[PDB]
Design a protein around this ligand. Structure first.
Ligand code: HEM
Length: 153
């Protein structure tokens, strides 16, 4: 779990993400993609830029990145109360997104990378540990939802 302090730190960092949700959103995906080709092959609309983003990966990347961060954002904002549901998103990433979490650990790395890159000095040990823990909770929540939905069970 995350303590009130850890949540406040997370929300503080996230206010910076949210302030430039689109930017973080794109950056995170671009980073994820360039780091792990397999994550890029997955999204048909991004996959077309086969060489992990032909230095474009925009407009649609923005739309998704925003959707994506807003969802994880809501989760984080709800400080443990698992997006009020999570289940529908667990279901998509379960059935369509190629079952196991895996890639969510890659986006966790991407998130940590963008955060550290854009917000050094303040995104220190405590902040990164807190964000990482929050991402781990998120991944763990999806893992539990995969059991509920009758996949991970
Ligand atoms: C921060 C973690 C993530 C969150 C909060 C998230 C959120 C979302 C949301 C809200 C949607 C649209 C509705 C839905 O289908 O559920 C979506 C779709 C999708 N997600 Fe994720 N997602 C996450 C991570 C991932 C990762 C790491 C991958 C693959 C590397 C992935 C691949 C997809 C795909 C392929 C779609 C379908 C739409 C697309 O082609 O753009 N997701 N995601």
């Amino acid at each position: 779990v995350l303590s009130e302090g850890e949540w406040q730190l997370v929300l503080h960092v996230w206010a910076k993400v949210e302030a430039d949700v689109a930017g973080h959103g794109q950056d995170i995906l671009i980073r994820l993609f360039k780091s792990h080709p397999e994550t890029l092959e997955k999204f048909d609309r991004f996959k077309h830029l086969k060489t992990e983003a032909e230095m474009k990966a925009s407009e649609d990347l923005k739309k998704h990145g925003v959707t994506v961060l807003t969802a994880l954002g809501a989760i984080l904002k709800k400080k443990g109360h698992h997006e009020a549901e999570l289940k529908p998103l667990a279901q998509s990433h379960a059935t369509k997104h190629k079952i196991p979490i895996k890639y969510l650990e890659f986006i966790s790395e991407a998130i940590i990378h963008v955060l550290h890159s854009r917000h050094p000095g303040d995104f220190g040990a405590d902040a990164q540990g807190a964000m990482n823990k929050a991402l781990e909770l998120f991944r763990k929540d999806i893992a539990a939802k995969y059991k509920e939905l009758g996949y991970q069970g």
